[PDB]
Design a protein around this ligand. Structure first.
Ligand SMILES: Cc1nc(N)c2c(C#N)c(-c3cccnc3)[nH]c2n1
Ligand SMILES: [Cl-]
Ligand SMILES: [Cl-]
Length: 331
């Protein structure tokens, strides 16, 4: 499309500037003369594939909007949508910069355990809202870039980008989530549920504090190998029901599984989250040695919560309500 600054749409919106680009199209800053406020307009490409998937995004945002709870306010607000020049246009409140930009601004050294906690509490409350039975929405693409500050002065956040999202039992794609944040059940080709967003969140929170992705795989095989370095071989009962188990693993006579190895990873379960976090060693790279709010006891609570979020079994992985009751969140 490539929209000029100064362009006026429908005697209502004046286009200012490009905010961002994506596979879906583009996000522009625009002035709404009716509400008298700035808005972010997500402009979908005029191609059937992108239109049809953005129509699901619009449906799921409208579904969330009509459930006024108190847990609804960690999702970006869709104000309205329209068709213009054969592009579906989604009008959102303006938010600020994203949590990947936040990490880039720390030179990838991470934010404090106290700021990590504030993000974790908001995100767990968002996931509790999506798990409302009448919604049952799987975000499917949680990552730092898809979490935006509400205000550059403040630590409030909202989730954006429901472009991959589906309701439970309305799955389209087997291959979903951004690779670094992709759950073992998705890597293993298994039917997925809301628990894949909790996996992503556990990956996200470690990264927000260390500055670096927990599992930075170059491809699905490297991904699973990096998860196994930290968490060990997945349980047999999961691998036994997994269509893609033999992408990564090999079963042996006695009903046990091991990695397929290629040409020359740390042995399974030996890259300890205890050491990645630096629980007993002054935090990541020892850079938090001495800082208040970064005691061993504070770290052990964080580590415990993360290891519950990174349960291989989506049935036993911690769920949002129970994550909100964790000791990590008690003052
Ligand atoms: C400044 C700003 N405000 C927003 N509301 C969004 C917004 C939304 N919703 C997205 C976005 C990014 C990726 C995919 N879809 C939407 N970028 C944004 N920037
Ligand atoms: Cl990232
Ligand atoms: Cl996806």
């Amino acid at each position: 499309m490539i929209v000029k600054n100064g362009e006026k749409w429908m005697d209502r919106y004046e286009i200012d500037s490009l905010i961002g680009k994506g596979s879906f199209g583009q996000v522009v800053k625009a002035y709404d003369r009716v509400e008298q406020e700035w808005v972010a307009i997500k402009i979908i490409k005029n191609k059937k594939a992108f239109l049809n998937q953005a129509q699901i995004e619009v449906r799921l945002l409208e579904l969330m909007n009509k459930h006024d709870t108190e847990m609804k306010y960690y999702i970006v607000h869709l104000k309205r949508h329209f068709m213009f020049r054969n592009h579906l246009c989604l009008v959102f409140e303006m938010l600020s910069y994203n949590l990947y930009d936040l990490l880039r601004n720390t030179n990838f050294r991470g934010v404090s355990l106290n700021l990590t906690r504030k993000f974790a509490q908001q995100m767990c409350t968002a996931l509790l809202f999506l798990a409302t039975p009448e919604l049952s929405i799987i975000h499917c693409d949680l990552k730092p870039e898809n979490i935006l500050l509400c205000n550059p002065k403040r630590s409030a956040i909202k989730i954006v980008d429901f472009g991959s999202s589906c309701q439970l039992g309305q799955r389209i794609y087997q291959y979903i989530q951004s690779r670094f944040y992709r759950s073992p059940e998705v890597l293993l080709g298994m039917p997925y549920d809301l628990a894949i967003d909790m996996w992503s969140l556990g990956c996200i929170l470690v990264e927000m504090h260390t500055g670096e992705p927990l599992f930075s795989g170059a491809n699905e095989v490297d991904q699973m190998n990096k998860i196994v370095e930290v968490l060990g071989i997945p349980p047999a009962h999961i691998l036994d029901q997994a269509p893609k188990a033999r992408k990564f693993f090999e079963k042996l006579p006695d009903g046990t599984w091991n990695l397929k190895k290629t040409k020359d990873y740390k042995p399974p379960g030996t890259r300890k989250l205890h050491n990645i976090l630096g629980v007993e060693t002054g935090g990541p790279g020892g850079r938090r040695a001495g800082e208040s709010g970064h005691t061993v006891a504070d770290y052990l609570k964080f580590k415990d919560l993360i290891l519950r979020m990174l349960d291989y079994d989506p049935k036993t992985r911690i769920q949002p309500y129970y994550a909100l009751q964790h000791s990590f969140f008690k003052k």
